[PDB]
Amino acid sequence: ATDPFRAAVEFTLMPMLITNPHLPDNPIVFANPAFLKLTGYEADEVMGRNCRFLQGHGTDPAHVRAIKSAIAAEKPIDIDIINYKKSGEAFWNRLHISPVHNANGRLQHFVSSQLDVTLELSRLVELEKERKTLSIETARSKDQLDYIVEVANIGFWTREFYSGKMTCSAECRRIYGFTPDEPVHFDTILDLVVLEDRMTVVQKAHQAVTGEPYSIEYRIVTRLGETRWLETRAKALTGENPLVLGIVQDVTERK
Amino acid sequence: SQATDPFRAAVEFTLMPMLITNPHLPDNPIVFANPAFLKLTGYEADEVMGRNCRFLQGHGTDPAHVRAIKSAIAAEKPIDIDIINYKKSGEAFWNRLHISPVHNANGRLQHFVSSQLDVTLELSRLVELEKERKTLSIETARSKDQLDYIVEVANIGFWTREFYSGKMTCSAECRRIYGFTPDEPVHFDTILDLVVLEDRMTVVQKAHQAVTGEPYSIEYRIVTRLGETRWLETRAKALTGENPLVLGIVQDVTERK
Ligand SMILES: Cc1cc2nc3c(=O)[nH]c(=O)nc-3n(C[C@H](O)[C@H](O)[C@H](O)COP(=O)(O)O)c2cc1C
Ligand SMILES: Cc1cc2nc3c(=O)[nH]c(=O)nc-3n(C[C@H](O)[C@H](O)[C@H](O)COP(=O)(O)O)c2cc1C
């Protein structure tokens, strides 16, 4: 009864325009509510006007040239172009323009879809470059850490407070009876701690979450039956998943 | 006979996936799907006509969303909802769906119209990419904290040098090894100014040769601003790349000899 297509265009989320090439300067003869919502204009502010008003300073002339060419050829076009809201706000317009021809092939109208793709072409790209920057920074900060621990030969370890998972420097591993590449946990260290010392170590390891620095003097018996006297100085980095940092030294020789 | 409908073509040529149903037919079936809809879903026209749009729902579809749609349709009210839908392939996508009733002049319901906008980038890729950026942001801060801790706890005389600029950072120990202020600005020249004349050239040649990335060692004397002769032993290595950073560890070996 009331054209389903007229209503489909009226109620769609897709900003849409219909122009009349037979009228001077191919003006807008229809803009749907979604278009007026995207741009901030009122119907009266866009009718009888060529769609050019969407272009501004940041608009690439090569893009305008491509559109001009396609319209003159009476050929469809898909282009991503910088356009401007009534506010002055720039946005990426994933534009589509299609000619409307009758059965004879007589050009009668032009139709368009204007999809704001700013998230894809601007936010997603800038967030992707922001993480590559942060990815290099982390690798550089790690390289600095690995250098100091190897050159200054520091027995440095990190421990995820809740998980228990550990990382161990080459020196930290040689202090205990560890393999250069074997995975370490607080349990791999506890397995070596002398029975008489086990409770104090579990006790100070739990009070790490406070963030205040501490010291732990304990003995170990290595997997090769060697009794070593250790002195550890630790501090937990507070936050979401606290990371306890510690430097271990083998104080056995002052005996 | 000659005037083709601009609206029929607008729907045909739009980038927006669109559906038209007939509530007067059993189960409110699809009576029209535009090429953009068939392109998004991977279906063929014949595979979607005469069918309720429900076939887009799957396991991950929230039943609360389906009830909101069922309710709005029954009320003959428009609806905007973000719902998990599925492509012919089985591929899950975020559908920013819109459904609107179509009423005639006497206000009689005649059709339902829709727009199905794939918003997966916004509700899924953007969210996961931010959660990923936060993670690295904390990691960077934690990696710095680890470095600052080692240099303070282990008493390390550690410095960094921007290869081209000469912009140097010194640790509190590095600063006490030379005759430096705890917060004064340090450059390779601030160090060179203290190096004994007899040693200056060996230091400058090795500093320029650092960019190779190959580690090196230097043993040189300094005379502090306080007139003290100190024997130093430095071990350095430049981190290669688009901006080389020279890392070095200085030790005061005067004590030894
Ligand atoms: C149906 C239709 C929709 C259009 N929509 C837009 C649009 O959203 N953004 C835009 O920058 N240009 C749009 N244009 C293009 C301009 O109206 C115009 O054709 C272009 O600026 C090239 O012509 P010119 O060099 O004479 O300005 C549209 C054109 C038509 C026919
Ligand atoms: C015009 C129109 C378009 C619809 N498009 C979708 C769609 O893209 N995705 C979807 O999950 N459901 C869509 N629906 C909703 C379902 O067809 C159905 O109404 C819903 O699953 C609730 O009814 P039910 O509980 O009987 O299944 C659409 C409904 C109408 C009327």
Residue numbers in the entry:
A (entry chain A): 19 to 273
B (entry chain B): 17 to 273
Reproduce the article's own wording on this structure.
LOV-HK is a blue light photoreceptor from Brucella abortus, a pathogenic α-2-proteobacterium that can be transmitted from cattle to humans causing brucellosis. B. abortus LOV-HK comprises an N-terminal blue light-sensing LOV domain, a central PAS (Per-Arnt-Sim) domain of unknown function and a C-terminal HK domain. The LOV and PAS domains are connected through a long linker helix denoted the Jα helix, while the HK domain belongs to the HWE family. Upon blue light illumination, B. abortus LOV-HK photobleaches as a result of the adduct formation between its flavin mononucleotide (FMN) chromophore and an adjacent conserved cysteine residue as in other LOV proteins.
We have determined the crystal structure of LOV-PAS in the dark-adapted state at 2.74 Å resolution. The chromophore environment in the LOV-PAS structure is consistent with the dark structures of B. abortus LOV domains and other LOV proteins, where the FMN ligand is clearly separated from the protein moiety in the electron density map (left). In the asymmetric unit, four LOV-PAS polypeptide chains form two elongated parallel dimers. In each dimer, the LOV domains, the linker helices, and the PAS domains from the partner subunits are juxtaposed along the extensive dimer interface. The tandem LOV and PAS domains from the same subunit have no direct contact, and their dispositions are swapped relative to the helical spine resulting in a cross-shaped dimer. At the dimer interface, two long Jα helices (residues 135 to 171) consisting of five heptad repeats form an extensive coiled coil via mainly hydrophobic interactions. Although the LOV-PAS structure is rather straight, modest dimer asymmetry is evident when the four monomers present in the asymmetric unit are aligned according to the LOV domain. The CD dimer exhibits slightly higher asymmetry than the AB dimer. In the dark LOV structure, the isoalloxazine moiety of FMN forms extensive H-bonds with the conserved Asn101/Asn111 and Gln132 residues, while its phosphate group extends out between the Eα and Fα helices.
